[PDB]
């Protein structure tokens, strides 16, 4: 539980920001 949310959500943060910025700009 804690290890899954930490290794999946508490690891990749700039990837989601780059996907929303590339989908909003491009």
Swiss-Prot record:
Changing residue 10 to S: In melittin-S. Expressed by the venom gland. The modification N-formylglycine is found at residue 1. Changing residue 14 to A: Loss of flexibility in the center of the helix, is twice as effective as melittin as a hemolytic agent but has very poor voltage-gated pore activity in planar bilayers and voltage-dependent ion conductionce is supported only at very high ionic strengths. The modification Glutamine amide is found at residue 26. Belongs to the melittin family. N-formyl-melittin major has 80% of the activity of melittin. Melittin: The secretion of this protein into venom follows a seasonal pattern. This variation is synchronized with phospholipase A2 variation, i.e. their production increase in the same months. Monomer (in solution and for integration into membranes), homotetramer (in solution and potentially as a toroidal pore in membranes), and potenially homomultimer (as a toroidal pore in membranes). Melittin: Main toxin of bee venom with strong antimicrobial activity and hemolytic activity. It has enhancing effects on bee venom phospholipase A2 activity. This amphipathic toxin binds to negatively charged membrane surface and forms pore by inserting into lipid bilayers inducing the leakage of ions and molecules and the enhancement of permeability that ultimately leads to cell lysis. It acts as a voltage-gated pore with higher selectivity for anions over cations. The ion conductance has been shown to be voltage-dependent. Melittin-S: 1.4-fold less hemolytic and adopts a less organized secondary structure than melittin. This is Melittin. The chain holds residues 44 to 69 of 70 of the full protein.
